Amino acid sequence: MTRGRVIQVMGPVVDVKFENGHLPAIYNALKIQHKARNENEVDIDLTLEVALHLGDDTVRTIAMASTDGLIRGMEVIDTGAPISVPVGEVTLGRVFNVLGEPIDLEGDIPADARRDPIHRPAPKFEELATEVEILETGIKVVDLLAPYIKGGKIGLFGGAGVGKTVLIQELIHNIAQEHGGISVFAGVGERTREGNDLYHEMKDSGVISKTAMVFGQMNEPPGARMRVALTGLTMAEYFRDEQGQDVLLFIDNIFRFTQAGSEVSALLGRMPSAVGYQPTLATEMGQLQERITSTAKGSITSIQAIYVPADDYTDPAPATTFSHLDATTNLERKLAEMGIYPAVDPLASTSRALAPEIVGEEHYQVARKVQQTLQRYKELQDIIAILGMDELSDEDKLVVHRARRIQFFLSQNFHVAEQFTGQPGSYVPVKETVRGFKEILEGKYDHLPEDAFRLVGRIEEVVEKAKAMGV
Amino acid sequence: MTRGRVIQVMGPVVDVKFENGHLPAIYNALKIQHKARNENEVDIDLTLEVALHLGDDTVRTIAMASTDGLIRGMEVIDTGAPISVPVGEVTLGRVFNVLGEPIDLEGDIPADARRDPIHRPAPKFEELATEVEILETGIKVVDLLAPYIKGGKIGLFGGAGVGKTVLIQELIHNIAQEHGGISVFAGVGERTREGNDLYHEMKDSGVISKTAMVFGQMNEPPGARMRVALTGLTMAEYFRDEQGQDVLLFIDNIFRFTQAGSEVSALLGRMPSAVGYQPTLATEMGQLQERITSTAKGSITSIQAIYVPADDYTDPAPATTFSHLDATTNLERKLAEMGIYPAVDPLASTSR
Amino acid sequence: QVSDVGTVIQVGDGIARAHGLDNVMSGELVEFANGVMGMALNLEENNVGIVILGPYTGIKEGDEVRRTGRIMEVPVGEALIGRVVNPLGQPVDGLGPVETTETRPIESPAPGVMDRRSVHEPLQTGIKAIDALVPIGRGQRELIIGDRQTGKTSVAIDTIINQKDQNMISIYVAIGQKESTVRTVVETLRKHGALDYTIVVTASASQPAPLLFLAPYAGVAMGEYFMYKGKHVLVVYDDLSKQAAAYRELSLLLRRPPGREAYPGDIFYLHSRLLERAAKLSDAKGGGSLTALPFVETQAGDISAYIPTNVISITDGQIFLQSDLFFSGVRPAINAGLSVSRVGGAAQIKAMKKVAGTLRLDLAAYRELEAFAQFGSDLDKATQAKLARGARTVEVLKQDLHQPIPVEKQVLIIYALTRGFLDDIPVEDVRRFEKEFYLFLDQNGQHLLEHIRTTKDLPNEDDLNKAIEAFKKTFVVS
Amino acid sequence: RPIESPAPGVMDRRSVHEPLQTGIKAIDALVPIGRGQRELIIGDRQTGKTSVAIDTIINQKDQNMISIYVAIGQKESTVRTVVETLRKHGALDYTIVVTASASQPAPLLFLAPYAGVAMGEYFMYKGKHVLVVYDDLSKQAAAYRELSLLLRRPPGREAYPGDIFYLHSRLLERAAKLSDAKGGGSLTALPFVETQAGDISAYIPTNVISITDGQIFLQSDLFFSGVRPAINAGLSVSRVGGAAQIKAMKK
């Protein structure tokens, strides 16, 4: 027979014993359906995933929901296949959970719909593409110091309470409304209020007609938090694999996946790692990251947000994900506290597209000059903090004078922040910002006060702000 | 039955095996008395305290003295109750150890005196006073700049050569003269010569007639060093529970209590904590600090000294101790040199 | 018999192990022969792990354990209002038993994505600084963070007291506090007459860690019953650091590998599962609401610590208090740089929106100009005018404890301050001036107060200015 | 007599009132040492700590004292040279030497100080005065740690067992000044502690400082300059000091 019994319950981990010679394979799905016999029992409907083989016809599994009410000796049914999620044109405009069940209260999906397994191997070496081109976003810092790549990987690093949600919402508003393709959103391990607001905004804007969403949000157990991302990826891959259409993807927070993995690995019997993580941290992340690539059939562009615990950039989880990205942006609490938004570090951020033959000689020279001036200004902080500005030479004073103006001009005002301040916001082209930075570097605007460069947008508005102030 | 025999000896940890269905309860006390039968044995007199139930009719205990000379198979008897300490008028002007036996060369207490257990739950919510009142000490600086609250905890910061003993004696004398109360002094793990000097300074001043003293030496096991505060507190509680009067309590050092608890936890073998301390530091501190309260017919207030190791105020032990304090007093060597007594700093001291 | 009876094998440190109980289920409640309750965590092949929810000194090897047939539950009812109970729901005040007919489980799923709604209603706390700079709406999660000796309990007491005239139910949870302080808090709440609509849940510092571990969950379970009937509830947690420490101690006692700062990996989920239960329900579910105000304690003013960052990454904002400012006699020592409200702003009434911007600008200008006050005031008179305005605003923002101020009076006084009517008044007389202005408004500004209360909008500026000048005529400059 | 004996009681002691002369001007003027007091000497490796002990042993020629020297973890050639120079200066008429080289097994290194104090107590209880010097305690602590680890006992901070403080206090609490009824004898100890790179925040130094009544600091930089001894007066302290000096020196 293909039915087992429950042996041990240890929270999110359940043990099942099967008949000899009929053990299920790894990554299969098991179903438990029980009805109460008397007043001291509760109805149960739950699913499990196979993880390890312990020998003696024993299987170690992981639960996808709360395990309260389980009793030793219950019956288990084996399906013989991994988790399957419906995919196709039906998924457009709907909201799904970890198991592919709609939660939008718009009806059910017919049982004849095509569905695909979640687990699959990575694409081969010879099927990849390496074309590079620049994608424009409309933000001065990103467009100048770390251009994005169409069809690559982009990651955002930041701490707690630094302003990542505003930045990602601004990116969605600027890019998603004119992509002209297919968009997929994942909400792994984040707030429910943000998801509800995003859903209502999409409904109001009408973009929801060509997108799908899988949330699996913060309150869900680690079993679901480890599979939401895989469900979203297997939903996204079908379009570019069977139609060759351009796909744009978002991931809400990838750190919660590794956090849930570390939480689960403790009860499986593995020895702790250096900082208490699982021993298999690298391979588990690599298997997922290597699956998001652009091939000859189609291209996929993705934007990911990564959480930095306790503002420590040397933590293993943030440190091991740097080798998978192409362009990175870093947020700093020190810059955030000074009133500079979106508080992007100009020296830590890097990109692969910053080349003379890709962007342009003038842009390359301007960026290099700005970085050099910023570094030279940074080198004088120790002397400035103690001995003041009096002991500096003539060149250092001018360097500081222009560095302050550049640092203040690097800020910008967004459309989303209008509801809190009343300022409409602006959209700045690459040529405009390059010309403005070149003019600033040339020393044309050395007579204006530094307070006129804050949240101004284009260069021409600086003059009108100064004359409104009274200069 | 209430009879068992030792199966394992290793350091200050002793395991005893009993019969099934007659295991002693946790925190009980055990006695071992044995006389040498041959020339290859040594007389033994030792006391144990139950800590855990390991199963299979085995009990793990901690020793209160040296364990040299123990032999596997030696019989053990059970008292059926935790450590008992005599209370009443007989304890005034006396010196006792952790077990309650007198140290002074003035005889022993008769065996028919009343004795009370060491471990006791905290008073209930219904018995607490609903109003806050100020205790009067008769010292201008304290009464004006840092008032004391009945049932509160006061932390004292200072060093050698400033007048801590003089201030303590003055407080005891004033309280005894005016409010009619008494005082109890408990020293946890301090220097024997300093203790003797303090004893002589109390003796030749006439204050010793209205106080009781409990001492715990440095050369004692951590289990013995961990219960001195408890025995002093249970000595003090009797007067407010029965007579109904205000009582003073003094603790020489509180850091030694936490370090002894950490050593005991390490000996038992539990996994360490944040900075190597015991996992139960907060609850161990609370179980001792929650019994010093003010009831509807009495109150107990305590003056405590803190060490603040490594001059770090974010250390977990000072952080946990600071959460129970209600006032702070400081002593200034500059004022002592200038000649102002009691050289209490008027700006550093704060009170709630 | 092994079906529903078991025997104890090992006892120690509040953790016990039993043999038997074949039909027991995970999360069920068990009862010892001594009468102490317990919870079953692990269902192993040969034994069951049990956590003791009480004094464990009375339990010995060989005792009898029997089932109860119910998942962990607490009694909930309307009769619970005005009582003081433990996390298990037993009365502690000694005023007799409590009768209830309904119970709710401790662990319950949170409302879904489609069941929520945007926050659009205000919550008045009675504190001028908070109500002006950091508005709080119904259904919002707001964090209060600061060092010790900052008077965090006073803010909670005042905001609980201020809800007398509004349809709100308050629940106060104390974790790891002192029984004398809890008694004094209950006494002053009774004196101010706030016991008619409040429930107090207590857990002393001498109680075991398992009892210290369930108080917030019990509070949320009690509040959900009123939340789901269409009412509004307010829940305050005294300290989450104590709960975190208790959970860390229990996990260490269970021999699990620790992580950063000896904390387990479940610490983030522990707080998320609790704080995710506060939401504003939609119109299709009755329109109820629930709000929470957790407290966090920091060491040496360090805001970049593990637990503070974990709590910040969940809530919708934070309020920071400074001990250095608190030492100067200012009770609401609110730092305006690190305190930000996100959900708020859309819940404020129209009167406060018209006035808050200029006050914020003046306060920011004064704070940024304070750095040069050592040798300042000799600059241009335009710069010199900033110092007087900043000092006057700082004097206005002060408040006395246990004295909430009505929102209309706050609007009027802030309008008077921002319109420059106080430029000719000495700094030392601002408090007496505002008290006399409140008295004059009560005596004569009845029509203006009624118009404000009825329309949520400012009255006509001509009449407002003439009334202000009429009052100012009779004021003594002293 | 057995090596493990109880310490004298609290009521059998008398306050220290008799000075001990070492013959070193800095020690005799700034940090006085009295009979019955036991004091810690701490420093780095190249500070010449052995010279102070040799000089203070030599200076007791005509003061009616008995000296015991205990060597723990030292080199046999160095011990031989010390014995030879002591014989040359004639100090072997009233001294006893106990040695335990680094090649010996750990239990001997662990047990030597108890044998030394057991030998001293016999002369102490007859009404005489005894001086005992311990060469190193960190090596004894390391040997005890090695034995406990080899015996499979649970470790603590820095892999040390849970009773290292008890082990040190039990040994250091046996020095006292007896009363008139007990005979009036006395015993004093001068334990040594060696630090690495000049830190004093380590576990064993903190434990020893929390027990002793004072410490004497030796400066590596001052020794490198050429000052003998390189005593640092800014950190040295003597709690018993003042009451253990003659009137002339006190004035």
Ligand SMILES: O=P([O-])([O-])O
């Ligand atoms: O604040 P956030 O959103 O977490 O960045």
